[PDB]
Symmetry: D2
């Protein structure tokens, strides 16, 4: 009954970061449906709260295993479990801001709980920007392009993202990810697409900055 995973698991999160020189630590928990491509996490700022920047920039920082993959398409992420995998991503904001996230996913054996260890670093978030002024609401749903790296055993992800502005309008960020399974897979997917729907809902109280994230993602092939 498992590829290391179950139809319903639990996940743990521990992020350490530094944005525009501001250090912070975060811990999270959630439950998900790897096979359905659905997940719900609860974040809490253990160190450095309240954060001075939008929680939005960290979202994608907080696991491709939560993707519904068709039979016809090879599932790189799931085939790496429970050993897991690591990933790296650069965030290129339209206003010069630059972020980098690196993560370690590891499927807990007997716990039915997926772990993720991340480090988030960013700088150049303009003081009068939507990030530092917390003027962002959510990311718009997307379509990411996933492509195998020949002779390297890794996957490349490419997605142009848009953060929705409280004041209406979009805010652009270019995502470029490197997906690395902990072991050379016998199998490798052909290039494909992944559609995402990341949503955020703050839940802070004058005693703790906390919030919830949700994600639904589905892999598809070119409709050609």
């Amino acid at each position: 009954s498992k590829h290391g995973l179950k139809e319903e698991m639990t996940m743990k999160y521990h992020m350490e970061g530094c944005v525009n020189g501001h250090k912070f630590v975060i811990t999270g928990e959630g439950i998900g449906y790897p096979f359905k491509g659905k997940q719900t996490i609860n974040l809490c700022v253990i160190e450095g709260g309240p954060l001075p920047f939008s929680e939005d920039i960290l979202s994608a920082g907080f696991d491709r295993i939560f993707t519904e993959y068709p039979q016809d398409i090879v599932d790189y992420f799931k085939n790496s479990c429970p050993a897991g995998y690591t990933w790296g991503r650069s965030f290129l904001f339209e206003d010069g801001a630059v972020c980098i996230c690196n993560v370690d996913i590891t499927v807990s054996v007997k716990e039915n709980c997926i772990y993720h260890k991340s480090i988030f670093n960013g700088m150049n978030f303009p003081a009068d920007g939507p990030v530092m002024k917390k003027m962002t609401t959510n990311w718009e749903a997307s379509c990411e392009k996933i492509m195998p790296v020949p002779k390297q055993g890794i996957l490349k992800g490419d997605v142009s993202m848009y953060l929705l502005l409280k004041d209406g309008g979009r805010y652009r960020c270019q995502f470029d990810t490197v997906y690395k399974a902990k072991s050379v897979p016998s199998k490798m997917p052909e290039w494909h697409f992944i559609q995402h729907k990341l949503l955020r809902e703050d839940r802070s109280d004058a005693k703790n900055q906390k919030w919830q994230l949700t994600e639904h993602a589905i892999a598809f092939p070119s409709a050609l």
Copy 2:
């Protein structure tokens, strides 16, 4: 029997360009199915042939009206016919090369023939690159993000493209387009996706550099 268009039309092309300082003129013809999102053009180099760069860079240079749009999604392009529309696009190659294309589409009334007047300019195509060394085969199929511009009556297109290398491997180009209907539409689509499949087949002979292009494109909504 027409939105200005028919299930089967004909199109004319006249491109004037300059790539890495090399000037050229091109004329083309084809037949298409606006409603099916299918088209086939035949290009011929009238001036400046043989071109010293890949024909591939010009492809996207050579009409969103050839897109199958679902009922539920507003069709900006078709609603602009037959008056047509113009579009602008910057091409950002991964090796520094930069191109700009600007076009004028105009639906011929009684001819059932769509016209397109373009000007293509590019420079910084490295001499030892896949473009100048003609090492490219085709563009990989894609998914473009289409979004309405509030208060402006125009559409923005965003697509990360990949040119396939003869020698295997990808070559990246970032596309950013501005779509402008000749008149303020009463209607405006919500943001959506467009999937493309552009193919190329050279047909040159030691007496003329000629070639054929084909395209199939389908508009979709977020699968969320």
Copy 3:
């Protein structure tokens, strides 16, 4: 008494362009001191005036021969006269706008007058930007890096520019130029620097959009 040039010459300008779909033609004249690295031009909008965008974006569009070169440093531009040379440049604005300029410089023999034929194309200048809202005053002085291209007989120029905002503050544009002498030089400069001081002064009247530009530029070696 001349490298094709004199201590004081005259120059002619004819620019044809299209910015954000708006076409225009421009003609200019001036006098300069190639050897002093000083020049003064007078522009006039022959077609498409009044322009809807800042005149500022065209400035650099309107000749390295107007650079004071030290003895110790080879002067690529001057050594190409009077045959002249061509150059290409991509303009990468911080707000997505993209421009491309291509030029032909040709030293008139018996006229003591330098000619320049340019084509300027640009798009994606946001409607609510400093360019379309004409909120710019001048470019800040700069330092450009000039480097020889091995095995190619051309020069590369690299400069991060800043347009001054009426409302105070900077507006960034990345410049990347390719300098190509019409003939393979026996000599080639080593990489060096060029410092610039481009200024603008409008002179339009309710009967013609006209303006003046000035430039002072000096080549230097690394002060190391």
Copy 4:
């Protein structure tokens, strides 16, 4: 006898990083002439050696206080001593690689020794690139543009860098730094230039990966 600094000091370095997922720790020491704009450091890989990437990418990672400033130009860095300052920088490589460095400089009171605490993160360094293949020799000397940030009490640095290739040729990296004094200065420099000369000399032995860096930098005003 000091602005917190002396004509000759000592400096300590402790870097923690992660490049393309590879973690490492580094410690260094040197002696310098803040007022002469000269410094010499000795690096040693305490953790994660031998590094799999060029030492070159870390160089600029390893203090503007080592800059010769003219009287006429305000010295932001020195005026922050000995309290010191922090700085942030994004590194944008031409092949997609992205790095981020954040540092804390603190002038030791009675030690005459300047401390620097850094964290370096980078990813997307292509496996077949000059960084991962260690094909780089040194950075070419440069000219950086330094500009005050109005209403913010910080400095912005902008420099287009070139790494020299063993195999001849250049490798581009765009530098964008934020300089932040620990306290609001009464004084603020006007925008200016800084010219640099960073050199590297490996000194590793089959028992330790160690190396030496040197730097000479001089602030100047526009020569206009």
